[PDB]
A paper describes a structure:
Human ORP3 belongs to the oxysterol-binding protein (OSBP) family of lipid transfer proteins and is involved in lipid trafficking and cell signaling. ORP3 localizes to the ER-PM interfaces and is implicated in lipid transport and focal adhesion dynamics. The ORP3 ORD has a central ligand-binding tunnel with a flexible lid covering the tunnel entrance.
Structural comparison shows that the closed form of apo ORD has a very similar conformation to the PI(4)P-bound form with a Cα rmsd of 0.49 Å. The ligand dependent conformational change is limited to the residues that recognize the PI(4)P head group around the tunnel entrance. Leu516 is accommodated in the hydrophobic pocket formed by helix α6 and the loop β17-α6. These interactions seem to stabilize the N-terminal base of the lid favoring a closed conformation of the lid. The dimer in the asymmetric unit seemed to form by lattice interaction during crystallization process.
Numbering used by the authors: 512 to 860, 862 to 887
Write the structure that this text describes.
């Protein structure tokens, strides 16, 4: 897999953000159009993919007789979702096209990941991933707004992981993020709220993780404080460390480093500050190009022509795609059509896999009236 990118990143063309944001101080940024040079060659379905860069934590979890330690490893997996945002604090990803998909099949870590863009008004992304040790799925929409100085990220939705060999159902919240000084010199991100991890199927244990807010320069910057309590509210295991750096079991008589962020690629800054994991998800190999629907994001031109350094071709493709989506919003609006997304179905207000993607790839070369062209 390719540890480079066929062009370098725009180091900055963020004068644009100045007028575009201080002219939108309360507005849902999903509703505000922006020049493509402010994007990054990834989208929100792949950014949900990122949440499994450390999936192997789960690969250890279900392999432990102790429930509480399984919780501990889960809490580590949960926090690790935020680690990638330390270096990529600002940049917005591509808003997925309605109906778009993304597929990543990793034999390496042994999971199969698929994702679809299921609604555009509002923007909802649905992801499902299958592994022998866990199934990981969720459903999110972002309420991003820019106040005077800092930019807010508000994920809405919950995250579900099950461990079969133990029948474990872990469910926890996403949490808020202010990016302070997103226009000023040093963008520093900060996470707000409490993550609560519940086992639905196990009453024994529940986990609370808190983000310590501290002045940017404190020695407690980016600190976390976690506990795994029993039913009675008494503390069992404590987690400590920093959410971009390292997490630890223990804290008392003994301790262990349960998680460590991978190190960044060599001179990562010149390629949008991606993790190695990130550089590997809009990279397209020869053998897979004959196995996936034409709605996978690697096909998306403006994305690829930005990965390529062609600002003009990207800016062109992008307006083409967007006005096409207006036309089809309107085409199924006049036919009073409630669009239904392809391999996710809505239940109780969550988009879960209907159970069709993996097996509809199971047989080679699905060219079976590949449902609408998007580019």
């Amino acid at each position: 897999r390719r540890t480079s990118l066929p062009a370098p990143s725009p180091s900055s063309s963020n004068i644009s953000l100045w007028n575009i944001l201080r002219n939108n101080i309360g507005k849902d940024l999903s509703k505000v159009a922006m020049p493509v040079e402010l994007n990054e060659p990834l989208n929100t379905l792949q950014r949900l993919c990122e949440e499994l860069e450390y999936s192997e934590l789960l690969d250890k979890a279900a392999q432990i007789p102790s429930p509480l330690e399984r919780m501990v490893y889960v809490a580590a997996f949960a926090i690790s979702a935020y680690a990638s945002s330390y270096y990529r604090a600002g940049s917005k990803p591509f808003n997925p096209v309605l109906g778009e998909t993304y597929e990543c099949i990793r034999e390496d870590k042994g999971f199969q990941f698929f994702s679809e863009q299921v609604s555009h008004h509002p923007p909802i992304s649905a992801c499902h991933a299958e592994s022998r040790n866990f199934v990981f799925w969720q459903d999110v929409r972002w309420k991003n707004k820019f106040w005077g100085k800092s930019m807010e990220i508000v994920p809405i939705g919950t995250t579900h992981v099950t461990l079969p060999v133990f029948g474990d159902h872990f469910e926890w919240n996403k949490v808020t993020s202010c990016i302070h000084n997103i226009l000023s010199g040093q963008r520093w991100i900060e996470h707000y709220g409490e993550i609560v991890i519940k086992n639905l199927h196990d009453d024994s244990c529940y986990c609370k993780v808190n983000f310590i807010k501290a002045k940017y320069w404190s020695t407690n910057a980016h600190e976390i404080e976690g506990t795994v309590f029993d039913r009675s509210g008494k503390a069992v295991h404590r987690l400590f460390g920093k959410w971009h750096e390292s997490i630890y079991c223990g804290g008392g008589s003994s301790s262990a480093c349960v998680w460590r962020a991978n190190p960044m690629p060599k001179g990562y800054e010149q390629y949008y500050s991606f993790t190695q994991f990130a550089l590997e998800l809009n990279e397209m190999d020869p053998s897979s190009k004959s196995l996936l629907p034409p709605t996978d994001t690697r096909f998306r031109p403006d994305q690829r022509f930005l990965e390529e350094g062609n600002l003009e071709e990207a800016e062109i493709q992008k307006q083409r795609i967007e006005q096409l989506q207006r036309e089809r919003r309107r085409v199924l609006e006049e036919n009073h059509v409630e669009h239904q997304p392809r391999f996710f179905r809505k239940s109780d207000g969550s988009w879960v896999s209907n159970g069709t993607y993996l097996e509809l790839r199971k047989d080679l070369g699905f060219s079976k009236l590949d449902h609408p062209v998007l580019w």
